[PDB]
Amino acid sequence: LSLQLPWVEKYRPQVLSDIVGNKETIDRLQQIAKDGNMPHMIISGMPGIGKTTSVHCLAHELLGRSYADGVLELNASDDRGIDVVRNQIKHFAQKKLHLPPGKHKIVILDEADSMTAGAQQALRRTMELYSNSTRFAFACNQSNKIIEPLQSRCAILRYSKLSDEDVLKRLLQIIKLEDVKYTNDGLEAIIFTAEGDMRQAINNLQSTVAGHGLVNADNVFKIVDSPHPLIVKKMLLASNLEDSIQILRTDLWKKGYSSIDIVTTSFRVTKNLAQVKESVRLEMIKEIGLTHMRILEGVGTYLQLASMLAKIHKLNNK
Amino acid sequence: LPWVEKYRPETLDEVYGQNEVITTVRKFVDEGKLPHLLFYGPPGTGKTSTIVALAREIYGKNYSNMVLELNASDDRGIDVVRNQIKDFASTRQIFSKGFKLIILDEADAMTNAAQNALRRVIERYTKNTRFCVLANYAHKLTPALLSRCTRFRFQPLPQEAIERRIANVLVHEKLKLSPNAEKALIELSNGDMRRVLNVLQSCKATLDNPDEDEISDDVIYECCGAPRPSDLKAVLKSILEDDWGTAHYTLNKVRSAKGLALIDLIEGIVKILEDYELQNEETRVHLLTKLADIEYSISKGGNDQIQGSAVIGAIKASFENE
């Protein structure tokens, strides 16, 4: 047997210059690393965009040698105990270490917004008590969920979804490092599948390389578990409602694709239908989103998809 | 013993196919790039057999010490399985080298908090432990858990393979099945072999004659507790051809006597109506939109009689377009 090292873990960024997206936030973090004084910061944004990686890279940049022991990572929603993690924070902060005067120990907490008001007040008191030695970083989805004192004391950094250009640049870097043979349509397919999700894009690239070796559209969509975009495009653009329903019933519903995947792929494909007028695309997107809302409420049947197709067809032919 | 345990596809030969997943996992192991795997699809496709075969091939004789098999949904709760995983990953033998595999079955049954805890555990022990997650529906899993794992989808078995397996089960169990009953069973199971085996065993149990009697489609529909196509066809004919009083009476009488929920009646009627040859497309547009609205309203509660009359009116009004 041998050790396992996935590409996603292997090529996670280490220095702040490795991160591709969020140019302004990365520039601010680089400035903070340069001037050698980390303030308390709260990073917020939509979930799954890799917020904690930025503060880990910041800690690596700040601590030239103390990066191994000067970083503590915890999860606020971890049911091991809010009091338990608070006590661990107190122990880590009270544990002084040899450092240059401008640096401090760094604690990273995830899912801070899910904490109670009392828990946030306790963390605020702890941060004030050990502000001379340990600085805190809070990762949250909604900034307003964090109490006002913490927001006022901390510096808010906003993290946004990565654009397709950043995903393309990162994928090209990984491909060059991994001598991956690819085609432009394959990378376009991977970027299309992973809507700003760097982790999913890297995972799909690795899986496609393992499965087929060549990264082209057909291989990518064979590896990818979502419905094929060409099938969804044929279903959406069919001039006859019977044809659209037939394509759905045969190629998507009977193939085992879930309704969530179908509506998500419909949203993705409709958004990119360049030959259709944008007003028509917006109407189609509105209908697809309505059925997505219905599905997420627990209906998620075949009749909802058929009705979505009926409304889209009604829009298309005017 | 349950008929699901028997006739289980314990070997790759009994697997219907789609060995591309097996080959890709094998190449992941060979290249040292094996990620946390997620196998999902219809129940009974053989995900458990595939993963145990892969584990046997990877490790060899030292199977039980390096591989831990668990069911994510168990009566002992989240804490017990979490403790099991933590004590399995934390402990290291003298010959500790490589990685250790943990397999979770029926992971979609876990609650969101349990899934988040499992994701945190996977992230913590990822240095020396590789997780394989099995589920029936990938969409039921939390997006946070889906991001960690590499998704592999299992296609439903082709109808010919299902028919061959059904014939094998019938000849092994000495059961005679009507062709209509077989078609009904295949349609109801929609590719789930576990459902096929359970329904066949229950139907054999319910027969007054254990071996000589023939299982009809009526018996299959009673065993599954599903709307019979004859009832739905009668309701649809009454709606289309009879006046409002007769249609209302027929719908209420049929779906109360036979115990058919209104949403199941709508689903069956939509399934039947798809085979109709409609001259006008507006008929289909109105039918689909109105019936979807009615079903969505039913999901939220509301007045049942009003919703039934809404179904009748929606079907009647659309066919005015011919």
Add this chain to the structure above:
Amino acid sequence: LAQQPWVEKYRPKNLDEVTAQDHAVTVLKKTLKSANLPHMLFYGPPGTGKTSTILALTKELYGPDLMKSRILELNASDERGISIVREKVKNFARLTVSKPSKHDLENYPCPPYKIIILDEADSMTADAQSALRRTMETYSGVTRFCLICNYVTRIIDPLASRCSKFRFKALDASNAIDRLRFISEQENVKCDDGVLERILDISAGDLRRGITLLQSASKGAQYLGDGKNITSTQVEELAGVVPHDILIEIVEKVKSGDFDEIKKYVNTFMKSGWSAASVVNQLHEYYITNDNFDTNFKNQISWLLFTTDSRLNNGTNEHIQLLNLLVKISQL
């Protein structure tokens, strides 16, 4: 003794006392003759005798005294979620089986297992039913499940396969009215002409709701110490049902079609406190089953009533919804 609800007071005691469910009672008698009792799935219209029959079967299996210890009655819709129900079932199964006395052993078969009755099973979600199936599989050695529901099609296939299904026919109007009349005579309830018929109509044939309404009417007539017969207006009041005169006035105002008259009437109507949902339900009943309206009118009015009911179910202002509904019908 203290006062007891008439629903549980007049349940049939033995299987021979179930009136109209000949088929289900016969099949259950045959199953009881066998020493092995499978999982049972009771389905049919509400208030037909499902819980009564399962209780009678349990009483015959265990005896009047041992029945309480061997039975756990649950309601899957009443509980917070799956976890509480499954934990209660686990605790009941882990609890040691009660010791039957010599009389219990010699007068009744006293099977070793314990029967668990789960009411309103069809209201469970798919995940809840799958967890229930897993729990049933875990403790199938000592517990036999009975699922009581109105729609068998709302129960998932894996769970429904394990259960032998008994279909209960809807009670005929004559049988239900005779049962209500017997209850009224036993309890000395003075009822005028058509009061029991009105109770059945309000309950939509549900004998449980009919008995509950009859008991409430009897208590109300006890409060009003005039000693007179219960009137249909009183039972309409106790059920939150709008009087037919107000419904006819609403229909006439809609027929005339003047917007201002309809608005004024709805403003006056909302001050009386009558429920708007009851008005929508009774308007649906009036219009749909009426021979003086053609097919197109009813096609339109069914959708109108459906839209109004859907909006009312969202917790909206009753006045606005009712006015919109009445104005839209007047334009048909």
Add this chain to the structure above:
Amino acid sequence: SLWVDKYRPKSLNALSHNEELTNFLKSLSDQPRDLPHLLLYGPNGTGKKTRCMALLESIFGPGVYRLKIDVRQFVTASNRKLELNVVSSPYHLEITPSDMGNNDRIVIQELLKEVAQMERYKCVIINEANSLTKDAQAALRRTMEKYSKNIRLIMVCDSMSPIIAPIKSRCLLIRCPAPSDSEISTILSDVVTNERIQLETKDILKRIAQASNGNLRVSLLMLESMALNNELALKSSSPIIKPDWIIVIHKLTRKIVKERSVNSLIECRAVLYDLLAHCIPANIILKELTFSLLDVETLNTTNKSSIIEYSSVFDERLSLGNKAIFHLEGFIAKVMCCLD
């Protein structure tokens, strides 16, 4: 000591309107031991809370009015701290669990279990029962089943439709219609004779009753406001005094009818922001605006039909949204488009 509160009936004998309901409540107090769970539903400001308190006084005595107020603290899952204002007496409790939002279920469970453990029985008055969540109502049904020995619930709501059927089956439905204009006039006449208010004619009281639209609280407060404005001498020419927010909404209605443009819509937005910021609920604003628009005499049937349809749509949207100004502005824009 406002006249609406000074002359509130403190007993079942002091009630003056809806005599049949008073007789029924008197009959209920004759057998306190088997008191049913109650659910009182009707229009606002008709005397439901007064009748509940009078029934409590009949059962227990005047001590029910010795009301003391306290704050109870509860701990939820994930250790969330809650505070509920519980108005108590030596005999009864009053709670408004809807004030806790979706956390009303746990509050109800904990408080009712505590009261049952402490205890022949203690009456709990639940205000705004129609705004309780479905989970809270299920918990209430469970507590009714468990603690019927020591807990008797008196739920008060304005509409019984949001109440679930299982609760309705286990409670006695009591319908409280709004008083007629004659009864309101009689009550106001009693008040003015008590307070020594000059009246040119009794038709002024009829006008107040008509303007109050069956709301007895509103009619009493309007009478007091009118009396103060006229130095305790009401004349036949004395104008009806309406609240500030109603005047603002009527001004908005006149503005919408007069001019339909985008600038008018911006100024309507400013007005709506003014109303919402000062604790005027969005549903109240929508209802008042809709029924002011329908009373404009220059509009035809088509305009009014469109207005009521848009009102229904955007009322449903208000019940499902977060930011109310969005829905109110959408409704006003649609009405402006339809009036053209």
Add this chain to the structure above:
Amino acid sequence: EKNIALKPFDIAHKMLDGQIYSDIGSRNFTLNDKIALYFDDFDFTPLMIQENYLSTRPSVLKPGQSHLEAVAEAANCISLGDIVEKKIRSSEQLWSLLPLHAVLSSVYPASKVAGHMAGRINFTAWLGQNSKSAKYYRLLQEIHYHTRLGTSTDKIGLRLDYLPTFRKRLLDPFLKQGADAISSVIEVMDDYYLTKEDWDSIMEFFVGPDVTTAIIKKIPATVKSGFTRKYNSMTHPV
């Protein structure tokens, strides 16, 4: 630094530009770019669009369509987007609906009323109004807690019905009687356990013709001094 505050303004100005909604503008600036504009600072973009979508001069009007019809359609879409946002940010955590919320709250309403900006891109007023509403609801809750024993009403009923008559009984006597009315005002306050802080809070709730800021300011300072002195000189019920 300051560019962070200018990002929502830039996004709102760009999304309401009518050039990017013509055919050529759509080709040059596709729908993906517009949704990406939303996802840059997705907290404020729907608020800015709802704030500024009435201040444009539309150039994308269909033939026979007026500006008012376009703003009505945009407002309808904004309301739908608000419902979607509520379902997203609730406990269900439906973060997969973010692109749908983008289209419903930012892109579609902008498409309906895109054009030249008639004026300036104003910041959203909803945040300040929400804070003000929360403050006034807290004040109303405090007043209701103080006056709950004496009044038979809920909090909303207290705001809608009781407060005008409380204004007649607590502020009007000062205008016509002056310092002579201090005793009666204090007596009325004592009957409802109203502190002077509650007296200050009550007068802030009135709108339209009943605003009391100028009226209170016009009251002589001697009357206010006598009022506070008399209140502080006697014990009060609690």
